[PDB]
Amino acid sequence: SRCTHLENRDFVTGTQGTTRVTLVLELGGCVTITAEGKPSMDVWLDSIYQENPAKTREYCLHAKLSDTKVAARCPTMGPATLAEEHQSGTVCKRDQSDRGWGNHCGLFGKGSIVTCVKASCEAKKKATGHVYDANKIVYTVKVEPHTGDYVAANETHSGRKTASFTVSSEKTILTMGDYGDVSLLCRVASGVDLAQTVILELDKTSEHLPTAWQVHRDWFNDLALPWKHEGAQNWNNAERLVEFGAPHAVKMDVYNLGDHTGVLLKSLAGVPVAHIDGTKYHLKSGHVTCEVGLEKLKMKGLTYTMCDKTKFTWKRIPTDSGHDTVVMEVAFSGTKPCRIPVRAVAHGSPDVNVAMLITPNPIIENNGGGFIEMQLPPGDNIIYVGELSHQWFQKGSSIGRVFQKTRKGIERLTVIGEHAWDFGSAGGFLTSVGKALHTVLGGAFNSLFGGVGFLPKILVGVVLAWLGLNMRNPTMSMSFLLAGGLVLAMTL
Amino acid sequence: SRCTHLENRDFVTGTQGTTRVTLVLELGGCVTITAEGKPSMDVWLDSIYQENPAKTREYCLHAKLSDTKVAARCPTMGPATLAEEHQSGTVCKRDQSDRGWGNHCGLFGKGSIVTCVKASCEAKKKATGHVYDANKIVYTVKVEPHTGDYVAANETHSGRKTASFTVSSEKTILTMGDYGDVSLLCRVASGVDLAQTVILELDKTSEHLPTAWQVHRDWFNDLALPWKHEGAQNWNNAERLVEFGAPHAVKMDVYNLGDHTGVLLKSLAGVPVAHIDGTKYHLKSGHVTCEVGLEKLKMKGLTYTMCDKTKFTWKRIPTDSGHDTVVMEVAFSGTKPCRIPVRAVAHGSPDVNVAMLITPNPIIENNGGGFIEMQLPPGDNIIYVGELSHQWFQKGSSIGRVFQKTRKGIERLTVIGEHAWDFGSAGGFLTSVGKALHTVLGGAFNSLFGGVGFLPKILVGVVLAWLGLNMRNPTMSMSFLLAGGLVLAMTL
Amino acid sequence: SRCTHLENRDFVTGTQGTTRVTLVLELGGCVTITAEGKPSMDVWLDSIYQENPAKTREYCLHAKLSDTKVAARCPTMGPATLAEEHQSGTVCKRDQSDRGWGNHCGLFGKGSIVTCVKASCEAKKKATGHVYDANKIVYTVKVEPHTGDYVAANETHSGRKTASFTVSSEKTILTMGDYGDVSLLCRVASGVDLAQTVILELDKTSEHLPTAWQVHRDWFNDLALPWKHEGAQNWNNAERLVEFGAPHAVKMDVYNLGDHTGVLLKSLAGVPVAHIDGTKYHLKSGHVTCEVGLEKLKMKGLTYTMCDKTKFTWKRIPTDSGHDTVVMEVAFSGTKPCRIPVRAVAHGSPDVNVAMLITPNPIIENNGGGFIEMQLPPGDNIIYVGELSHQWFQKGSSIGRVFQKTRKGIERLTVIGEHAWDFGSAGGFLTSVGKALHTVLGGAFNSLFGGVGFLPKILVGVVLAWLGLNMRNPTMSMSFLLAGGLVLAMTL
Amino acid sequence: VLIPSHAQGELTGRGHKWLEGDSLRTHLTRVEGWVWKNRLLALAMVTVVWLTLESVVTRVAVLVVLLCLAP
Amino acid sequence: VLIPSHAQGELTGRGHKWLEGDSLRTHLTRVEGWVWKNRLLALAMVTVVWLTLESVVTRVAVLVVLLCLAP
Amino acid sequence: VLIPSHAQGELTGRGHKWLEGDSLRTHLTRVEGWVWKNRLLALAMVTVVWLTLESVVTRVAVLVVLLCLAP
Ligand SMILES: *[C@@H]1O[C@H](CO)[C@@H](O)[C@H](O)[C@H]1NC(C)=O
Ligand SMILES: *[C@@H]1O[C@H](CO)[C@@H](O)[C@H](O)[C@H]1NC(C)=O
Ligand SMILES: *[C@@H]1O[C@H](CO)[C@@H](O)[C@H](O)[C@H]1NC(C)=O
């Protein structure tokens, strides 16, 4: 049961006869799939990476300046000119000095002056922007059967399976061993928007920094630095790291603005970190749409015998998972293998089972089993495992759980619904209408207010509310009602 | 395919039972004529030229002047005279000079003076006008089968067949090899309006200019430059390049206004270019109406077995053509010949072959085959070639494509004019009435408008709109109808 | 009497007790100073010139282009670049071309393309601007006494005197033999504006053109052509004679817009010509104010005997001059020197002389004298020289001469502008008021609508009239008469 | 691209002038030649103004404006 | 002397065209430069037209007409 | 994290220590860019405020103030 390790776990449920289930998988999240008569699976998107991306630009972070030269002219002797003005990799400026008898000219007045320096980029002071190729990125999905064995985060479950989806991938069959077989399919076209992502890499071996960052393409293209394309010989806009002092007689001075790394890193704030693993460049934020096929899964040990009721013992006592589920582990000491006599009752002992087992048909195997995961109705309950028993009090009210489930839905709804409304296993008659409305609403609310940001959005919403107070006639008030909906959407 | 090479191809199509389809083969464009149960063809017009078109008149752009001679007589004596006034091919002027005992006359006053110069054109500084002969103009039209072999623009497909059309030439039958015989008629009488058209040469074989321009008969006949007919020995109005100085004592200067060529080249701005290829004078704009006789083309290889699904490999993966088609190439290592098992499956309908192939019955043969082009509906699809596959997301939108087709139609009607009305087919009422009204209205409008120019269009529109606002009676509404009609038509 | 050789003679007249006359000498004019009891003087500004003015700019009139090169990149391979983009004297352009599998790229889309040519000015096709220096320009004033021996314009008078003026100069004393001394003071700072003037020259060797033109500084500075200062090796804005055709797939064509000289020569059409005499750069328009101290002029020959009336004969019979003035020459065969008895007696009125002699105290000498100039009353006259007589008829009319003289005053006001008040000025309060009014009006009208030119000034004047045709209040009704004055100021 | 002229009245003086007469009246020629092309429209345009501007005097100003705008 | 611009006159369609866009643009650059040098007088005449009102569209019509009539 | 801009203190007005005084005017490219990026919304605000307000100066000054408050 991997996904006990992880906040942002989701549950999905299939009816009897449910054969194929749509999901949206995302990094830092997991789906526990359950269905009637079928073993449960934990499914998650492990990693989004590409080997050897292409690259877009290099930016310079610290200029090296050298070979300052100056030329000047008396006030009527026309423009001063330097031979270096046309050499590649130089920064120049032209200006007017003041001249007179005191500078060995004939005339008092203004006289032309020009200055140029060689400009280069300091060793290991470049930023490189890498970009993805839609045909080569790999979407790695992993699946684990709920075998009822527990393993830590620094252990590997014996039955973990992996598929590596790509544009060439078609559809994958994963042999789960005794649990049968799962069909799995994922649409890379539905993945991250590879167009708008740039992987900003700084030069190597910085110990106390991220290895790379994931940044917006237009922001990266708007950096205020000298730049060149891959393999180009010289830096464009090299003047951006240089300033020229005011001219003074025949003399003019050049000031290096120094290392701009600090203003970059201070500008890289609120920005998701990325990762690099040798040649593999990984994202850390993204999602994919997949289509899990429960057709051929089956359950181990439905013919196994019932265990001895007397021989159980708690190894891990019932405790709260923080998902409103109870997790536990029993040792067993009889002859094996056998089915674990799990049941639970509400207090007053009506002898009606209220255990929602997430673990299918719990079994003690010849060398494994005994972990159990349950959901229970609110209030006072008694859990039983054979004769072994434990009083449990379940915290939240039913209306509280309903609200919390809606809050989880809303929490995912911004990220997933902006990608796709249909997380909820194709409630299609409702879901398609909701998707259409949300699509056109997002179209409006993004074409307007696009890039405005939450605070300026809200401020303009308040301006529109004041216009509401200024609406002379009912139709104008309807236009305010539209602005009300806008300002609500932006405040939410 | 050729038409892949061009940003401007039209997918004319015909149902089963369709024959003798009608095209209007705009130069600088291509037609992919696809017919159910028949081989697809690419058809286009490759050249419009005439060999050695006759010439109208010549201008000179830089005068050579020589033998300046002057005579003058005292004020009471009489008029000054030169024989160089009668010896034709000179430029001359008579004027009056102040004279007196300052200049050895007997009496003060104004006395007659005459000046003459010989004039001729500078070497290779002529310009020349040529005019097409409606019974010697030649058209050429090329057809190429969709064999499923790709061929770059610097290579020649083995099925590229050329027809040459002269108005004396009846229906032409071209044997497309195994696919059978296509036939054409391309009656030259639908060509460009040769009466409007003059070709302007500049006599030099300049290394950095277009070799000729195409210009309207009026503008070329209006030029304010000295001119002659071919083989006439001397220039008329040569004075247009010669400006006399003001008289002074017994003397007048003659000043030469120098080379006009930069003026002419700048005044040409806006004009269509042409080309000269030895003796052949090619236009670079036009069209012709072709009947295309498809009735004898036949499919190739409907009786071959399928290929083995296993052995296909992507030589070139599916990629967007920019024409909203998917273009791809496979290579196959099995025995030959065999039929390619192409399919495309929509996400919504896993059992439906949605692939609308442009290529007919795609075949592998001992030296060719395996290039494929298809069209797909917007959204998410998986292309297959037997076992080989590729996820394709068709980026367009149905309404967007229809709107783009309306834009194409508007463009065609603008550039072609009335002939556009009978593109594709006779089209019954809508086409014939549209042609009739468009011809009548466009003829009357061009009769009023011809030469008025852009800013005068805007001026007249604004004037008519202002009058429509100002004036009283109901007929002014019709004037506004004219005002809007002109304004939008001219602004579109 | 040099001034007889010109059309535009002027007369200036002094009573007894005339001292320092003020003149405005004008280039191409000539002033006859006359005074009671003194010899008359011709005075004129002979020439204005400077040796080797400083070159302000060169402009190029015909670019040579060579070494065309091109580089291009497939749609994602970033900017194409050339080493030529940085060098001196290269013109380059960057653009995009449509590329795809038709030209061996992998992607359909817009490739990057760049092209460069060397651009250099062809041979002699340069225009050079020169600027005068107030410290070095020399104004040459000449003076000639009315000694009464005639000479043609083709021959040099025996007593012509030259003064050269510069900032180094002072009251200059010219000794004219027995006619005494004359004092010239001329204000170099009162001459032409040396900032507003530029001499433009082309190839001086051009057989049928003037050597130079006296253009205005702002026009020459706003010329569009490629330009550089003297000695600079590389043309700024060299692209302005070059243009690049639309990108084909992997090519851009480059075109030379040809010899601009005809455009420049046409644009000159407003301009007064100038002149170059080896090193001496001469102007052909301008004026200087001068003060001519008459006080030491001396009458020659008042002690001589009267000539014998018997012995005159005509060397040149009387004639009009077009200055409403009669000129003649007599021979003599008595002993000499002597004083010529010249008189004129109107008709039928024998005792009233009417000979207003302009050549004073006429004398005949060994190889000298004998030429006489006088002005006469309109109508019949008899001219006598001793016993020699001629029945001159003086055409014209009494009021006609007054009208002609006052019209010349308007011509003077038109061509001089402000300074016309100085001409003939012996100081007077009314003249000072006139100069004040003219200076304020000229300052307003030169600032308001300065450089607007006559047709746009007509436009603005009539617009200002229209804006006053029928108006709400008289409070700005002056505007219509100001417009009338503007029209009058426009008219001339 | 283009070289403008400059006003005839700027420097003046009595010297010989290059193309002295060509600065002004020549500009009328393009208008007359324009009329000789436009004529059907031109008379129509005139009559359009003439019929609408029954306010007589402003006919002249309007048609002068139109003719001077006419290339 | 003068040669008229053909730029619109042939109305011809698809192909390759000499110097097309700068032909249209340079007229506007002429008006922009004339306005730029005028702006003192232009603003004065603007306020003079403000002394008048048949309509604001008349005001802008007269201003545009004047700026197009002059270079 | 923030460093306060010295122009708020500007301990002597005689100073010449950087370009930055002119650069502050270049920083109006923030407002102008916000204008250029949102012209249709600005024109919307224009069309709104030009119609909704009766006062004439506020129909400039308020929009100016809002565009200067926009970052
Ligand atoms: C996993 O971590 C625990 C605690 O850090 C440690 O006792 C155990 O040995 C680790 N096992 C592995 C395989 O790293
Ligand atoms: C066509 O162009 C390609 C450019 O890559 C070249 O390799 C090939 O040899 C050319 N073929 C012909 C026939 O020109
Ligand atoms: C002009 O003057 C020269 C000498 O200065 C003389 O020889 C010649 O005869 C003169 N010209 C005429 C036409 O007499």
Author numbering:
A (entry chain C), B (entry chain B), C (entry chain A): 1 to 492
D (entry chain E), E (entry chain D), F (entry chain F): 2 to 72
Authors' own words:
Tick-borne encephalitis virus (Orthoflavivirus encephalitidis, TBEV) is an enveloped single-stranded (+)RNA virus belonging to the Orthoflavivirus genus. Orthoflavivirus particles have icosahedral symmetry with a diameter of about 50 nm and a genome of about 11 kb. The glycoprotein shell of the mature infectious virion consists of 180 copies of each of membrane-anchored E (496 amino acid residues) and M proteins (75 amino acid residues). Envelope proteins E orchestrate the early stages of viral infection, virus entry into the cell and receptor-mediated endocytosis.
In this study, we performed the first cryo-EM structure determination for the particles from the clinically approved TBE vaccine preparation based on a Far-Eastern subtype strain. It demonstrated the reliability of virus samples inactivated by cross-linking agents for structure determination and surface epitope analysis, which is especially important for emerging viruses. ELISA studies with monoclonal antibodies supported the hypothesis of TBEV protein shell cross-linking upon inactivation with formaldehyde.
